[PDB]
Coordinates of C-alpha atoms and ligand atoms in Angstrom, one line a residue:
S1 CA -39.9 -25.1 7.7
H2 CA -38.5 -27.6 5.2
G3 CA -38.2 -30.0 8.2
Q4 CA -42.0 -30.3 8.8
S5 CA -42.8 -30.4 5.1
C6 CA -40.3 -33.2 4.6
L7 CA -41.5 -35.2 7.6
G8 CA -45.1 -34.7 6.6
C9 CA -44.4 -35.8 3.1
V10 CA -42.4 -38.8 4.3
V11 CA -45.2 -39.9 6.7
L12 CA -47.9 -39.5 4.1
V13 CA -46.1 -41.3 1.3
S14 CA -45.1 -44.1 3.8
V15 CA -48.8 -44.6 4.6
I16 CA -49.8 -44.7 1.0
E17 CA -47.1 -47.3 0.2
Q18 CA -48.0 -49.5 3.2
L19 CA -51.7 -49.3 2.4
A20 CA -50.9 -50.5 -1.1
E21 CA -48.8 -53.3 0.4
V22 CA -51.4 -54.3 3.0
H23 CA -54.3 -54.4 0.6
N24 CA -52.3 -55.7 -2.4
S25 CA -53.5 -52.8 -4.4
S26 CA -52.3 -50.2 -6.9
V27 CA -50.9 -46.9 -5.6
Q28 CA -53.9 -45.2 -7.1
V29 CA -56.3 -47.3 -5.1
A30 CA -54.2 -46.9 -1.9
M31 CA -54.5 -43.1 -2.2
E32 CA -58.2 -43.2 -2.8
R33 CA -58.5 -45.5 0.2
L34 CA -56.6 -43.1 2.5
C35 CA -58.8 -40.1 1.4
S36 CA -61.9 -42.2 2.0
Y37 CA -60.8 -42.7 5.6
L38 CA -60.4 -39.0 6.4
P39 CA -63.2 -36.9 7.9
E40 CA -64.8 -34.1 6.0
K41 CA -64.4 -31.9 9.1
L42 CA -61.6 -29.3 8.8
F43 CA -61.4 -29.9 5.0
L44 CA -59.1 -32.9 5.7
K45 CA -60.8 -35.1 3.1
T46 CA -60.9 -32.3 0.5
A47 CA -57.2 -31.6 1.2
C48 CA -56.4 -35.2 0.7
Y49 CA -58.2 -35.3 -2.6
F50 CA -56.5 -32.0 -3.6
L51 CA -53.1 -33.6 -2.9
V52 CA -53.9 -36.7 -4.8
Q53 CA -55.0 -34.5 -7.7
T54 CA -51.8 -32.5 -7.6
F55 CA -49.2 -35.1 -6.8
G56 CA -50.9 -38.4 -7.3
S57 CA -49.5 -39.3 -10.7
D58 CA -45.9 -38.6 -9.7
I59 CA -46.3 -40.6 -6.5
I60 CA -47.6 -43.5 -8.6
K61 CA -44.7 -43.3 -11.0
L62 CA -42.0 -43.3 -8.3
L63 CA -43.5 -45.8 -5.9
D64 CA -43.9 -48.1 -9.0
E65 CA -40.1 -47.8 -9.3
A66 CA -39.8 -49.2 -5.8
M67 CA -38.5 -46.0 -4.3
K68 CA -39.3 -45.4 -0.6
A69 CA -41.0 -42.4 0.9
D70 CA -37.8 -40.5 1.8
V71 CA -36.5 -40.7 -1.7
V72 CA -39.9 -39.8 -3.1
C73 CA -40.2 -36.7 -1.0
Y74 CA -36.7 -35.5 -2.0
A75 CA -37.7 -36.1 -5.7
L76 CA -41.0 -34.1 -5.2
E77 CA -38.9 -31.5 -3.4
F78 CA -40.8 -31.5 -0.1
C79 CA -37.4 -32.4 1.2
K80 CA -34.3 -30.3 0.3
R81 CA -30.8 -31.7 0.5
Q82 CA -29.7 -36.2 2.7
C83 CA -31.8 -37.6 5.5
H84 CA -32.6 -41.3 5.4
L85 CA -35.5 -42.8 7.2
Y86 CA -35.3 -46.2 5.6
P87 CA -32.0 -48.2 5.5
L88 CA -30.5 -47.6 2.0
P89 CA -26.8 -47.0 1.3
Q90 CA -25.7 -43.7 -0.2
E91 CA -25.0 -45.2 -3.5
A92 CA -28.6 -46.5 -3.8
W93 CA -29.9 -43.0 -3.0
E94 CA -27.9 -41.3 -5.8
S95 CA -29.2 -43.9 -8.2
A96 CA -32.8 -43.5 -7.3
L97 CA -32.8 -39.6 -7.4
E98 CA -31.3 -39.4 -10.9
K99 CA -33.9 -41.9 -12.0
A100 CA -36.7 -39.9 -10.2
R101 CA -35.8 -36.8 -12.2
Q102 CA -35.6 -39.0 -15.3
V103 CA -39.1 -40.4 -14.5
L104 CA -40.5 -37.0 -13.9
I105 CA -54.0 -21.5 2.0
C106 CA -54.6 -18.8 4.6
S107 CA -53.9 -16.6 1.6
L108 CA -57.5 -17.1 0.4
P109 CA -58.7 -13.5 1.0
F110 CA -61.7 -14.6 3.1
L111 CA -59.5 -16.7 5.4
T112 CA -56.5 -14.5 6.1
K113 CA -58.1 -12.5 9.0
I114 CA -59.6 -15.6 10.7
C115 CA -56.3 -17.4 10.3
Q116 CA -54.6 -14.5 12.1
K117 CA -57.3 -14.5 14.8
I118 CA -56.7 -18.2 15.4
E119 CA -52.9 -18.1 15.2
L120 CA -53.1 -15.3 17.8
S121 CA -55.3 -17.0 20.3
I122 CA -53.2 -20.1 20.0
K123 CA -50.0 -18.1 20.5
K124 CA -51.5 -16.4 23.6
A125 CA -52.9 -19.8 24.7
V126 CA -56.4 -18.4 25.3
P127 CA -59.7 -19.7 23.8
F128 CA -60.6 -18.6 20.3
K129 CA -64.3 -18.9 21.2
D130 CA -64.8 -16.6 24.3
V131 CA -67.5 -14.0 23.9
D132 CA -67.1 -12.5 27.3
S133 CA -63.3 -12.8 27.3
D134 CA -62.9 -14.5 30.7
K135 CA -60.6 -17.2 29.1
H136 CA -63.2 -20.0 29.6
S137 CA -65.0 -21.3 26.6
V138 CA -68.2 -23.2 25.6
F139 CA -66.2 -24.8 22.7
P140 CA -63.9 -27.8 23.4
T141 CA -60.7 -27.1 21.3
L142 CA -58.8 -24.1 20.2
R143 CA -57.8 -23.6 23.8
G144 CA -61.4 -24.2 24.9
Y145 CA -62.8 -26.4 27.7
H146 CA -60.5 -29.3 27.0
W147 CA -58.0 -26.9 28.6
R148 CA -60.0 -25.2 31.3
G149 CA -63.4 -25.5 33.0
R150 CA -66.3 -24.9 30.6
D151 CA -67.9 -21.4 30.9
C152 CA -71.5 -21.8 32.2
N153 CA -72.3 -18.3 31.0
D154 CA -70.2 -16.9 28.1
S155 CA -72.2 -13.7 28.2
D156 CA -70.9 -12.7 31.7
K157 CA -67.3 -12.1 32.4
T158 CA -68.0 -12.5 36.2
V159 CA -69.3 -16.1 35.7
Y160 CA -66.5 -18.7 35.3
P161 CA -65.0 -21.6 37.2
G162 CA -62.9 -20.8 40.3
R163 CA -64.7 -17.5 41.2
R164 CA -65.8 -17.0 44.8
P165 CA -69.6 -17.2 44.6
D166 CA -71.4 -13.9 44.1
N167 CA -74.1 -13.7 46.8
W168 CA -73.7 -17.4 47.6
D169 CA -75.1 -18.1 44.1
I170 CA -78.7 -17.6 45.2
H171 CA -79.8 -16.6 41.7
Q172 CA -77.0 -17.8 39.4
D173 CA -74.3 -20.4 39.4
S174 CA -71.5 -17.8 39.2
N175 CA -68.6 -20.2 39.5
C176 CA -69.9 -23.0 37.3
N177 CA -69.6 -25.7 39.9
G178 CA -73.2 -26.7 39.4
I179 CA -74.2 -25.7 42.9
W180 CA -76.6 -22.8 43.3
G181 CA -80.1 -21.8 44.5
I182 CA -81.6 -22.0 48.0
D183 CA -82.8 -24.9 50.1
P184 CA -86.6 -24.6 50.2
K185 CA -86.7 -25.8 53.9
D186 CA -84.5 -23.2 55.6
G187 CA -83.9 -20.9 52.7
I188 CA -80.1 -21.3 53.1
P189 CA -78.2 -21.1 49.8
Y190 CA -76.9 -24.5 48.8
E191 CA -73.4 -23.1 48.0
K192 CA -73.2 -21.6 51.5
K193 CA -74.5 -24.8 53.1
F194 CA -72.4 -27.2 51.0
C195 CA -69.2 -25.1 50.3
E196 CA -68.6 -22.5 53.0
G197 CA -65.6 -23.5 55.0
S198 CA -64.7 -26.4 52.7
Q199 CA -61.8 -24.3 51.3
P200 CA -62.3 -24.8 47.6
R201 CA -59.2 -24.6 45.4
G202 CA -58.4 -25.0 41.7
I203 CA -55.7 -27.0 39.9
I204 CA -53.5 -25.0 37.5
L205 CA -50.8 -26.7 35.5
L206 CA -47.9 -24.7 34.2
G207 CA -46.7 -27.3 31.7
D208 CA -45.1 -28.4 28.4
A209 CA -46.1 -30.9 25.8
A210 CA -45.9 -33.8 28.3
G211 CA -48.1 -31.9 30.7
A212 CA -50.7 -31.2 28.0
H213 CA -50.5 -34.9 27.0
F214 CA -49.1 -34.6 23.5
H215 CA -50.2 -37.7 21.6
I216 CA -50.3 -38.8 18.0
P217 CA -52.4 -42.0 17.8
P218 CA -50.3 -44.7 16.2
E219 CA -53.6 -45.7 14.5
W220 CA -53.1 -42.7 12.2
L221 CA -49.8 -44.2 10.8
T222 CA -50.3 -48.0 10.9
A223 CA -51.8 -49.1 7.6
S224 CA -52.5 -52.6 8.7
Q225 CA -55.2 -51.4 11.2
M226 CA -56.4 -48.3 9.5
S227 CA -60.1 -47.5 8.8
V228 CA -62.6 -44.7 8.9
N229 CA -62.7 -45.0 12.6
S230 CA -58.9 -44.3 12.9
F231 CA -59.2 -40.6 12.0
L232 CA -62.5 -39.6 13.7
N233 CA -60.4 -37.8 16.4
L234 CA -58.1 -36.1 13.9
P235 CA -59.9 -32.7 13.5
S236 CA -60.2 -32.2 17.3
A237 CA -56.7 -33.4 18.0
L238 CA -55.3 -31.0 15.4
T239 CA -57.3 -28.0 16.8
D240 CA -55.9 -29.0 20.2
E241 CA -52.3 -28.7 18.9
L242 CA -52.0 -32.5 19.1
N243 CA -52.5 -32.2 22.9
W244 CA -55.1 -34.0 24.9
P245 CA -55.2 -32.0 28.2
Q246 CA -58.7 -33.5 28.9
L247 CA -57.0 -36.8 29.4
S248 CA -53.8 -35.6 31.1
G249 CA -52.6 -36.7 34.5
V250 CA -53.0 -33.3 36.1
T251 CA -56.0 -31.7 34.4
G252 CA -57.8 -34.6 32.8
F253 CA -61.6 -34.8 33.4
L254 CA -62.6 -37.6 30.9
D255 CA -62.5 -41.2 31.9
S256 CA -59.2 -42.9 30.9
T257 CA -59.0 -44.8 27.6
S258 CA -56.2 -46.9 29.0
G259 CA -57.9 -49.2 31.5
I260 CA -55.8 -48.3 34.5
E261 CA -57.8 -47.0 37.4
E262 CA -55.6 -44.0 38.4
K263 CA -57.3 -40.7 38.1
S264 CA -56.0 -37.2 37.4
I265 CA -55.2 -34.7 40.1
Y266 CA -58.2 -32.7 39.0
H267 CA -60.5 -35.7 39.3
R268 CA -59.1 -36.5 42.8
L269 CA -59.5 -33.0 44.0
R270 CA -63.1 -32.8 42.7
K271 CA -63.7 -36.1 44.5
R272 CA -62.3 -34.8 47.7
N273 CA -64.4 -31.6 47.5
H274 CA -67.2 -31.5 44.9
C275 CA -67.3 -27.7 45.2
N276 CA -64.2 -27.8 43.0
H277 CA -66.2 -29.1 39.9
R278 CA -64.7 -27.5 36.7
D279 CA -61.9 -25.7 38.5
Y280 CA -59.0 -26.8 36.3
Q281 CA -56.7 -24.9 33.9
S282 CA -53.9 -26.3 31.8
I283 CA -51.6 -23.4 31.1
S284 CA -49.3 -25.5 29.0
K285 CA -47.6 -25.4 25.6
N286 CA -45.5 -27.6 23.4
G287 CA -41.9 -26.6 23.8
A288 CA -42.4 -24.7 27.1
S289 CA -39.4 -24.4 29.3
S290 CA -38.3 -22.3 32.3
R291 CA -36.9 -19.8 29.7
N292 CA -40.1 -19.2 27.7
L293 CA -42.9 -19.7 30.2
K294 CA -43.0 -16.0 30.7
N295 CA -44.2 -15.6 27.1
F296 CA -47.6 -17.2 27.9
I297 CA -48.0 -17.4 31.7
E298 CA -50.2 -14.3 31.4
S299 CA -52.9 -16.6 29.9
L300 CA -53.4 -18.0 33.5
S301 CA -56.8 -16.8 34.8
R302 CA -56.9 -16.2 38.6
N303 CA -58.2 -12.9 40.0
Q304 CA -56.3 -12.3 43.2
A305 CA -59.3 -10.5 44.9
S306 CA -62.2 -12.5 43.6
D307 CA -61.1 -16.1 43.0
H308 CA -60.6 -19.1 45.2
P309 CA -57.0 -20.1 45.8
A310 CA -55.2 -22.6 43.6
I311 CA -52.7 -25.4 43.6
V312 CA -50.2 -24.6 40.9
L313 CA -47.9 -27.4 39.5
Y314 CA -44.8 -26.1 37.8
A315 CA -44.0 -28.9 35.5
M316 CA -41.2 -27.9 33.0
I317 CA -40.0 -31.5 32.9
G318 CA -37.7 -31.5 30.0
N319 CA -37.2 -28.6 27.6
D320 CA -34.5 -27.0 29.7
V321 CA -32.3 -30.0 28.7
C322 CA -34.2 -31.2 25.5
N323 CA -33.7 -29.2 22.3
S324 CA -33.3 -29.8 18.6
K325 CA -30.0 -28.0 18.0
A326 CA -27.2 -30.2 16.5
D327 CA -24.7 -28.9 19.1
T328 CA -27.3 -29.4 21.9
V329 CA -25.4 -29.0 25.2
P330 CA -24.8 -25.2 24.8
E331 CA -28.6 -24.6 24.6
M332 CA -29.3 -26.5 27.8
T333 CA -30.3 -24.2 30.7
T334 CA -27.7 -23.7 33.5
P335 CA -28.6 -24.1 37.2
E336 CA -28.0 -20.3 37.6
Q337 CA -30.3 -19.5 34.7
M338 CA -32.9 -21.9 36.0
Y339 CA -32.9 -20.2 39.4
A340 CA -33.4 -16.7 37.8
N341 CA -36.1 -18.0 35.5
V342 CA -38.1 -19.8 38.2
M343 CA -37.8 -16.9 40.7
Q344 CA -39.2 -14.6 38.0
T345 CA -42.2 -16.9 37.5
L346 CA -42.8 -17.3 41.2
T347 CA -42.6 -13.5 41.7
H348 CA -45.2 -13.2 38.9
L349 CA -47.4 -15.8 40.5
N350 CA -47.2 -14.1 43.9
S351 CA -48.9 -11.0 42.4
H352 CA -51.5 -13.0 40.4
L353 CA -52.6 -15.8 42.8
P354 CA -55.1 -15.4 45.6
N355 CA -53.7 -15.7 49.1
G356 CA -53.7 -19.3 50.4
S357 CA -52.5 -20.8 47.2
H358 CA -49.9 -23.6 46.9
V359 CA -47.2 -24.1 44.3
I360 CA -45.5 -27.4 43.6
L361 CA -42.3 -27.6 41.6
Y362 CA -41.8 -30.8 39.7
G363 CA -38.3 -32.3 39.2
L364 CA -37.0 -33.4 35.8
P365 CA -37.0 -37.1 34.9
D366 CA -34.0 -39.1 33.9
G367 CA -34.6 -39.7 30.2
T368 CA -31.9 -42.2 29.3
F369 CA -35.0 -44.5 29.7
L370 CA -36.0 -43.5 26.2
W371 CA -33.0 -44.9 24.3
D372 CA -32.6 -48.0 26.4
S373 CA -36.2 -49.0 26.1
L374 CA -36.8 -48.2 22.5
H375 CA -33.7 -48.1 20.4
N376 CA -34.0 -51.7 19.1
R377 CA -37.8 -51.6 18.8
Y378 CA -39.6 -50.8 15.6
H379 CA -41.3 -47.5 15.1
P380 CA -45.0 -47.6 14.0
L381 CA -43.8 -46.7 10.5
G382 CA -41.3 -49.5 10.6
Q383 CA -43.5 -52.2 12.0
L384 CA -45.0 -53.5 8.7
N385 CA -41.6 -54.4 7.1
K386 CA -39.4 -54.3 10.3
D387 CA -37.2 -51.6 8.7
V388 CA -37.4 -48.5 10.9
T389 CA -36.1 -48.9 14.5
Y390 CA -36.5 -46.0 16.9
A391 CA -32.8 -45.5 16.5
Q392 CA -33.3 -44.9 12.8
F393 CA -36.3 -42.7 13.5
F394 CA -34.4 -40.6 15.9
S395 CA -31.5 -40.2 13.4
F396 CA -33.9 -39.1 10.7
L397 CA -35.5 -36.5 13.0
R398 CA -32.0 -35.3 14.1
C399 CA -31.0 -34.9 10.4
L400 CA -34.2 -32.8 9.9
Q401 CA -33.4 -30.7 12.9
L402 CA -36.7 -31.9 14.3
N403 CA -35.6 -34.3 17.1
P404 CA -37.2 -32.9 20.2
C405 CA -34.5 -34.1 22.6
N406 CA -31.1 -34.5 21.0
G407 CA -29.6 -35.1 24.4
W408 CA -31.5 -38.2 25.2
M409 CA -32.9 -39.4 21.8
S410 CA -29.4 -40.1 20.7
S411 CA -27.1 -43.1 20.0
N412 CA -24.3 -41.3 21.9
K413 CA -24.3 -42.7 25.4
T414 CA -21.8 -40.1 26.7
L415 CA -24.3 -37.4 25.6
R416 CA -27.3 -39.2 27.1
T417 CA -25.3 -39.3 30.4
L418 CA -24.4 -35.6 30.2
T419 CA -28.1 -34.7 29.6
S420 CA -29.2 -36.7 32.7
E421 CA -26.5 -35.0 34.8
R422 CA -27.8 -31.6 33.8
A423 CA -31.4 -32.6 34.5
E424 CA -30.5 -33.7 38.0
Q425 CA -28.7 -30.4 38.6
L426 CA -31.8 -28.5 37.4
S427 CA -34.0 -30.6 39.6
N428 CA -31.7 -29.9 42.6
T429 CA -32.1 -26.2 41.8
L430 CA -35.9 -26.5 42.0
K431 CA -35.6 -28.4 45.2
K432 CA -33.4 -25.7 46.8
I433 CA -35.8 -23.0 45.7
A434 CA -38.8 -24.7 47.4
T435 CA -36.8 -25.3 50.6
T436 CA -35.5 -21.7 50.9
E437 CA -37.7 -19.1 49.0
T438 CA -40.8 -17.7 50.6
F439 CA -43.7 -15.7 49.1
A440 CA -46.6 -13.9 50.6
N441 CA -49.5 -15.5 48.8
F442 CA -48.5 -19.1 48.5
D443 CA -46.2 -21.7 50.1
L444 CA -43.9 -23.7 47.9
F445 CA -43.0 -27.4 47.7
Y446 CA -40.8 -29.7 45.6
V447 CA -41.7 -33.2 44.3
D448 CA -39.1 -35.2 42.3
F449 CA -40.1 -37.1 39.2
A450 CA -38.6 -40.4 40.1
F451 CA -39.4 -42.4 37.1
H452 CA -37.4 -45.3 38.5
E453 CA -40.2 -45.7 41.0
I454 CA -42.9 -45.4 38.3
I455 CA -41.0 -48.0 36.1
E456 CA -40.7 -50.4 39.1
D457 CA -44.4 -50.1 40.0
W458 CA -45.3 -50.7 36.4
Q459 CA -43.1 -53.8 36.3
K460 CA -44.8 -55.2 39.4
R461 CA -48.0 -54.6 37.5
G462 CA -46.7 -56.8 34.7
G463 CA -45.9 -54.0 32.3
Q464 CA -42.7 -53.3 30.3
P465 CA -41.0 -49.9 30.3
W466 CA -41.4 -49.3 26.6
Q467 CA -45.2 -49.3 27.3
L468 CA -44.9 -45.9 29.1
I469 CA -43.7 -43.9 26.1
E470 CA -45.7 -42.3 23.3
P471 CA -45.2 -44.7 20.3
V472 CA -45.2 -42.2 17.5
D473 CA -42.8 -39.6 19.0
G474 CA -40.7 -42.0 21.1
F475 CA -40.3 -39.2 23.7
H476 CA -43.2 -38.1 25.7
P477 CA -44.7 -40.1 28.6
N478 CA -48.0 -41.6 27.5
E479 CA -51.4 -41.4 29.2
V480 CA -50.6 -44.3 31.6
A481 CA -47.2 -42.8 32.6
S482 CA -48.8 -39.4 33.2
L483 CA -51.5 -40.9 35.5
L484 CA -48.9 -43.0 37.4
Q485 CA -46.8 -39.8 38.0
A486 CA -49.8 -37.8 39.1
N487 CA -50.7 -40.5 41.6
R488 CA -47.2 -40.4 43.0
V489 CA -47.4 -36.6 43.4
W490 CA -50.8 -36.8 45.0
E491 CA -49.8 -39.5 47.5
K492 CA -46.5 -37.7 48.4
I493 CA -48.3 -34.4 49.0
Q494 CA -51.0 -36.2 50.9
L495 CA -48.4 -37.8 53.2
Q496 CA -46.1 -34.8 53.8
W497 CA -48.2 -31.7 53.2
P498 CA -51.9 -32.7 53.5
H499 CA -53.0 -29.0 53.9
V500 CA -52.2 -28.4 50.2
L501 CA -55.1 -30.7 49.2
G502 CA -57.6 -29.7 51.9
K503 CA -60.1 -31.9 53.7
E504 CA -62.8 -34.1 52.3
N505 CA -66.1 -32.2 52.1
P506 CA -68.7 -33.9 54.4
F507 CA -71.5 -32.6 52.1
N508 CA -70.2 -34.4 49.0
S509 CA -73.0 -36.9 49.2
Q510 CA -75.7 -34.2 49.7
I511 CA -74.2 -32.2 46.7
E512 CA -74.6 -35.3 44.6
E513 CA -78.2 -35.8 46.0
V514 CA -79.3 -32.3 45.1
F515 CA -77.3 -31.6 41.9
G516 CA -76.3 -35.0 40.4
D517 CA -73.3 -34.6 38.1
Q518 CA -73.3 -30.8 38.8
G519 CA -73.8 -30.0 35.1
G520 CA -70.9 -32.2 33.8
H521 CA -67.9 -30.9 32.0
Ligands
FAW601 C1 -41.7 -41.5 30.4 C2 -41.1 -40.6 31.5 C3 -39.6 -40.9 31.6 C4 -38.9 -40.5 30.3 C5 -39.4 -39.2 29.7 C6 -38.3 -38.5 28.9 C7 -38.4 -37.0 29.0 C8 -39.7 -36.5 28.6 C9 -39.7 -35.0 28.5 C10 -41.0 -34.4 27.9 C11 -41.0 -32.9 28.1 C12 -42.0 -32.2 27.1 C13 -41.2 -31.6 26.0 C14 -42.1 -31.0 24.9 O1 -42.8 -30.1 25.1 O2 -42.0 -31.5 23.6 C15 -41.5 -30.5 22.7 C16 -41.5 -31.0 21.3 C17 -41.3 -29.9 20.4 O3 -40.4 -28.9 21.0 O4 -42.7 -31.7 21.1 C18 -42.8 -32.2 19.7 O5 -43.2 -31.5 18.9 C19 -42.6 -33.7 19.4 C20 -42.5 -33.9 17.9 C21 -41.8 -35.2 17.5 C22 -42.1 -35.5 16.0 C23 -42.8 -36.9 15.8 C24 -43.2 -37.1 14.4 C25 -44.5 -37.9 14.2 C26 -45.0 -38.0 12.8 C27 -46.0 -36.9 12.4 C28 -47.4 -37.4 12.0 C29 -48.5 -36.4 12.4 C30 -49.5 -36.2 11.3 C31 -50.7 -35.3 11.8
NAG602 C1 -75.9 -15.0 31.7 O1 -75.7 -13.7 32.2 C2 -76.6 -12.7 31.7 C3 -76.2 -11.4 32.4 O2 -75.2 -10.6 31.7 C4 -78.0 -13.0 31.8 O3 -78.8 -12.1 31.1 C5 -78.3 -14.5 31.4 O4 -79.7 -14.8 31.8 C6 -77.4 -15.4 32.1 N1 -77.7 -16.8 31.7 C7 -78.1 -17.7 32.6 C8 -78.4 -19.0 32.1 O5 -78.4 -17.4 33.8
NAG603 C1 -20.9 -37.7 22.2 O1 -21.2 -36.7 23.1 C2 -20.1 -36.0 23.8 C3 -20.7 -35.0 24.7 O2 -21.3 -33.9 24.0 C4 -19.2 -35.4 22.7 O3 -18.1 -34.8 23.4 C5 -18.7 -36.5 21.7 O4 -18.0 -35.9 20.6 C6 -19.9 -37.2 21.1 N1 -19.5 -38.3 20.3 C7 -19.7 -38.3 18.9 C8 -19.1 -39.5 18.2 O5 -20.3 -37.4 18.4
CA604 CA1 -68.4 -16.3 31.6
CA605 CA1 -66.0 -17.0 28.4
CA606 CA1 -71.9 -22.3 42.3

């Protein structure tokens, strides 16, 4: 727990220092300026002012002595001994620390219960706001409709996206796809006329942080461009666990910020058959791996008897080789364990998916890409003064036991190579499972990651490989990379296994004519 506290202190004190530098101001003014940028929502501004009240005068004192954020946070004891973010020799650290010494909430009784209620729903990966308990929400975050189709009736547990339509939806839109009622000419229900025989299916992601599109905007950490507008998305991002599933390559339903034209798998499936409107679920968690998926897979919502079938993407693309343990190789999953873990998941899916479903296993990428692309580039926190490379950033995180992938985010080339060998072996295990293992309620397919193909296509497009990686964590594929990978999966399945995606619905135009945007998302 010291790790996060240390990292959080070092980030905050770094922004304060750089805001002072950028604006040529006192530290007092820089702290007031940061608080002025933060929204009131989620008590962020008030928390900022509380911190300034509590620690402001000590921060002023130490930053005035020209100590950097890492030293300050040890001195204030947010960090406990020594992890260097900024380049400074050991001798200079011992100097500064002796001089520093020389120079120098859910316990609220009315919050405890709601805090536990929120921690629980997050741990179970189910929406906190869900009156009828069908796991679909009217609220966007806290596992709400950013993560799955919005509930059109939160007072009816039999109304939710992906349901087979009750009574062809004559009187209610029971599956939230915006199609319901009867044609006045022939009295035929629109959902019957427009969706019967079209074989609707949902998209379900079983994913990790990359699949849920973990993303810390570098705008939150770069003083030179910071403003009130930088942090408007901070409350919702925090209550989404710093994930942005609504923009992900598999389950995204908002229009891309990036400016590439590639669309999510959900968007493509909705476009192929508009009856699939709102039928997405991101069953994804930061840190998810083949080993621990069983701890939250029960949050998936698909009633075997009453729901349309689904396409399920199994996308554990790294945490079976990526971990934060100093001796990192012993915690990497073995091929034999991977086989046992995946078979357990598939056996579980078989008894919880409607017949006619499809499961796609994703291979693991080769992540040596991370070090090679980034190690000599400057991290957002090092860009002002050109003093924190990604190598220094990775080393700092490793010292804090917070590096999310010690095997690849490492200056040790032999270890980077070993990690890639293991990832390939695990991908080959997934491949073999898809080729040889059969289940009653779904068929099973393998698609490799093949980031070399994505990097090549990106290079043809005029891009550089470093532009495919989240700038703040230096680890996850960013929104562009995620959409490029989803496009590759879509095309490959379209070419080899077109039945997985179904046919285009010939009534799509008539659906749009009668129902417009089908209620939106
Ligand atoms: C581009 C494709 C080819 C190369 C890709 C390389 C392999 C990618 C594997 C991603 C697999 C997802 C693993 C995961 O869930 O992540 C898990 C970890 C934790 O277990 O996620 C994290 O928590 C990352 C945290 C890193 C810390 C960064 C600190 C940023 C400063 C904090 C400021 C925030 C203030 C609100
Ligand atoms: C939602 O379902 C309930 C039935 O439990 C019904 O009373 C209510 O009218 C429904 N809402 C809409 C908009 O149909
Ligand atoms: C680099 O990684 C390999 C593989 O784990 C290990 O044997 C070696 O000791 C590491 N080198 C250093 C300098 O730590
Ligand atoms: Ca409902
Ligand atoms: Ca609900
Ligand atoms: Ca409907």
